[PDB]
């Protein structure tokens, strides 16, 4: 039961937590964001690589947003508003082939 999830340090909650399992692990989220703090967040799109870690599981799992899934938002607080889609494709090492690993650690 994939309740305790943790974006790299943060903790997330969602509503329809959905993982295609095959061909390609796709970690797909529903995270209903609030009007609250929603208008920074209409901006944000997939924005960065995600550290989905599932302690249950045990996945320590560094996955990359494709930034085509047409969707929007990122993270913050998960009310029960903007169900939103966080869908994460099981990384590959097709993008790129060079350590970019440089932003403050």
Same mark, same amino acid.
């Given at each position: 039961?994939?309740?305790?999830?943790?974006? =790299? @340090?943060? /903790?997330?909650?969602?509503?329809? *937590?959905?993982?295609? #399992?095959?061909?390609?692990?796709?970690?797909?989220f !529903?995270?209903?964001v609030? #009007?609250?703090? *929603?208008? $920074?967040?209409?901006?944000?799109? *997939?924005?960065? /690589? &995600?550290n +989905?870690? +599932?302690?249950?599981? $045990?996945?320590? &799992?560094?996955?990359?947003? !494709? =930034? *085509? #899934? !047409?969707?929007? /938002? =990122?993270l913050y607080?998960?009310?029960?508003? #903007?169900? &939103?889609?966080?869908?994460?494709?099981?990384? $590959?090492? @097709?993008? $790129?082939?060079?350590? %970019? %690993?440089? %932003?403050h650690?």
């Open positions: 039961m994939v309740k305790t999830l943790r974006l =790299n @340090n943060v /903790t997330l909650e969602m509503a329809a *937590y959905q993982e295609e #399992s095959e061909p390609k692990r796709k970690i797909a !529903t995270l209903n609030t #009007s609250e703090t *929603y208008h $920074d967040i209409a901006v944000l799109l *997939y924005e960065k /690589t &995600f +989905v870690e +599932v302690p249950e599981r $045990d996945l320590a &799992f560094r996955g990359e947003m !494709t =930034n *085509y #899934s !047409t969707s929007l /938002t =990122n607080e998960p009310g029960a508003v #903007s169900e &939103f889609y966080i869908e994460i494709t099981e990384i $590959d090492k @097709n993008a $790129d082939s060079l350590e %970019h %690993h440089h %932003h650690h």
